[PDB]
């Protein structure tokens, strides 16, 4: 019993990967047409 | 399981807390932004 | 052998998790001081406040919950058996 | 322990893939919309009070996605797959791969910025000269606060939650409701501080 | 051996209810002042108050009672024994 | 052994009583100071100023009264024997 | 062996009025605070003000004798 | 045997005349503090406010000579031994 | 006994002291600067973008306080200086 | 024997001192605070205000100075043995 | 043998470092306070309102090292073993 | 023999410094907290709040390095050996 959970494992290489290509995907797709968005929304104020 | 019963029936209760509390105010908030948009 | 470590383990527990929690009481404490005169003060800052408020509980309930993950560490892991 | 970030990811993916399509200036902001622009506006606006836009303009996306994948994998741990999943969080592995990131980040970015002899010397004087053997410890102790804060913030859960377990499920309905209802929202508050403590220590990184 | 844990169980639980019991007492003490001093400002304040007064009063007490059911763990369910 | 485990017994129940009664005297003397200053602010606000101090005296009360019923537990009716 | 409850009894007493004392010193402090402030800012209201005084401190003398008097059942009376 | 009652009773001395003595200081402290704020505005007050604060003093001071009194029962008086 | 043991054993006694003073110092200093912060947002509202910077000095010297207790922590208790 | 007694001499000792320390350095500078922040809302007053600080500083240093004294009866003149 | 004296040392560095934590922490905030106050009530002050934060940061850190210092000394030095 | 005496001896040290500490670290803030304030409410205040705030550092770092000493006199010549 107990496992010392403290330590690092090899699964932190893969969390960083997955979490990398979501920030990727993010700026490109969640941002720019946001941005623009928002820019002519407060054209149309 | 006894385990899985109990807490699904908390699950449960709390779905029904959020339902009635949070989610009026969330969706107040949301529609009074859309009409906000469409003020013009 | 292991017994006197575990013992020792469950005291360093306790006094971590107290400390913990005497922080923990005092910050929040003081923190819902600071809202509760300033919606006192500025019935209209109300909403205002709340989100400083819930950054300087998210700053103190941290220092406690450190706290309390390393009291689990030293109770359900104990080192040095 | 890994799939339950994977899961998050494809959650992630396919809501800017709804975003995407979605997206229009002519019609209604009924959509989603209405949440990944909630969190940009104030992610945009506190960056630019700080640090301002063009001075720093990448943080902002690095910002939301710190936040939005730090809040669902605290939110969708609350479902009754008691028994198979557990917030990510909780390993280490996840908020190193984090924090660690941040950090590393920030500090290219300094050394970009002021160069990389002129940065340490910047790093180490701090804002005063004694503070200075002070301050190259807290250059290391501010991505520790970052890690440690999201580990033991939702560590304390996923151990509350299971020692709950103990108890019958009649009585259990009771605690492990409250807990959740807790959590919720002490998971959004912590994904929240996370991705402002980045925003700030990104913004008297670049100065 | 079990009788040397058992005792340092107890130990440990007494310490983190007396922490707990300190930051709990100290910081509902707290709030209280702050709500006095607004429903002494404001008369009329007191539905306003009573809000964030529960809030901080929520967290506090929260954190108490998260310190007695570790010690309800260590006492009666000691994690090694 | 029954001796070590009521000896421990003991000390946590003083560690229990003892956090407590620093929470309580510590935070009712603190809900007393604002009771005070605010009478002093208004020499007719006592009517309504004591309502909410004894809201809060319950509170750091009801601490109070939990640590000092799991004192009993502890010390009386100890676990483990 | 008794002496090794002995020793823990005492030990415990020792805790129990050592927390009476400061929490009751520094509610007691606190209020003489508050006291000597309202009796500073409002000259004649010391008649109506040790009232309240009176009260609190009392509230907290409480805490005190009855941690005192569980300190006297610890060492005295010790069970075992 | 009765040396290890008698070093509990000198810890136990210890704690008691450890705490009376942080409580003591502490409450001096602040009853000094308001002093000076009231005779700092008011300069006339000394002779006013010497009444309240003596009052204080004394109050706390009991606790004080109290405690020793009962560190020299554990110390010198040494129940049970 | 095993000298080991008592010495695992006052190790984690230590550790537990250092993390215990280091998270009370810690919460109750966060919580002073959090009730300065949340005061002056109270009394000047648009003073938000000046004070967030005070706030984060007081709270950084804090953290690195409680974080190098820490450290010492995980030494005491991963290494046991002396044994 | 006398290895057992003064240990538990030397503990006692220790804890008198430092809940003597923790309290007179707490007191010396709440009542520091109020000496400056009088000296600050009315400049010429240092002298008028010393005296009232000299008076609480005394009360503070009595207090320490008297748990000095119990911790050097303690450490070098060990009661029992 | 040489184990007991260890495990004492280690007890007193840890309460060495416990203490010296607690005090930079609390002290440390209490100017943070003032400092953030001042901000918020005289926003053109920064420039010399620094100097004096960093004076009194400095003598509670100086403090602080001091007691790490002889925690360091204590832990790996032995003085006595 | 000598060894439990060293041990104590180390834990007692450990008390009275800790305790030195927190007091020393606290009271240099709260004095610290009167003089930002008073520094910023007026530019005089540099220049004459140093003489009271050296006064106050002065009464609680004289108290620090006296319970540094006497840590010393515990730990490096310890009575009973």
């Known amino acids: 019993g107990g496992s010392n959970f403290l330590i690092p494992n090899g699964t932190f290489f893969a969390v960083l990967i997955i979490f990398l290509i979501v920030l990727g995907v993010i700026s490109k797709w969640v941002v720019p047409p946001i941005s623009k968005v928002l820019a002519e929304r407060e054209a149309m104020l | 399981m006894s385990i899985f019963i109990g807490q699904l029936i908390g699950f ?7 339902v009635k509390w949070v989610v009026p105010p969330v969706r107040t908030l949301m529609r009074n932004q859309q009409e906000a948009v469409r003020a013009a | 052998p292991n017994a006197i470590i575990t013992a020792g383990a469950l005291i360093g527990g306790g006094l971590i998790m107290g400390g913990g929690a005497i ?28 989100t400083p408020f819930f950054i300087t509980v998210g700053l103190v309930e941290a220092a406690y919950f450190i706290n309390l993950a390393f009291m689990a560490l030293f109770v359900f892991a104990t080192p040095g058996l | 322990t890994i799939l339950a970030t994977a899961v998050t990811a494809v959650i992630v993916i396919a809501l800017a893939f709804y975003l995407r399509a979605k997206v229009t200036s002519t019609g209604v902001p009924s959509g989603v919309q209405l949440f990944w622009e909630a969190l940009t506006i104030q992610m945009r606006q506190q960056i630019e009070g700080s640090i301002g836009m063009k001075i720093a303009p990448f943080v902002l996306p690095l910002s939301v996605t710190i936040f939005v994948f730090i809040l669902i994998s605290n939110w969708l741990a609350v479902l009754p797959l008691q028994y198979l999943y557990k917030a990510p969080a909780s390993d280490i592995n996840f908020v190193l791969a984090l924090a660690l990131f941040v950090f590393v980040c ?72 409250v807990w959740k209802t807790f959590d919720l929202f002490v998971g959004l508050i912590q994904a929240f501080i996370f991705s402002l403590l980045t925003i700030l220590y990104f913004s008297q990184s670049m100065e």
């Open chain 3, 23 to 50: 922080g923990a009481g005092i910050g929040d404490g003081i923190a819902g001081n600071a809202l509760i005169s300033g919606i006192a003060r500025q019935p209209e800052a109300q909403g205002r406040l709340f």
């Open chain 4, 106 to 177: 920030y500090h290219a970015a300094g050394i970009w910025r002021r160069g990389i002899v002129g940065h340490p010397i910047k790093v180490v004087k701090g804002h005063v000269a004694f503070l200075a053997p002070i301050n190259i410890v807290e250059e290391l102790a501010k991505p520790i606060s970052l890690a440690l804060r999201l580990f033991g913030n939702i560590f304390a859960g996923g151990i509350l939650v299971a020692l709950i377990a103990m108890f019958p499920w009649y009585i259990q309905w009771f605690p492990n409701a």
């Open chain 2, 12 to 18: 449960a209760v709390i779905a029904f807390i959020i």
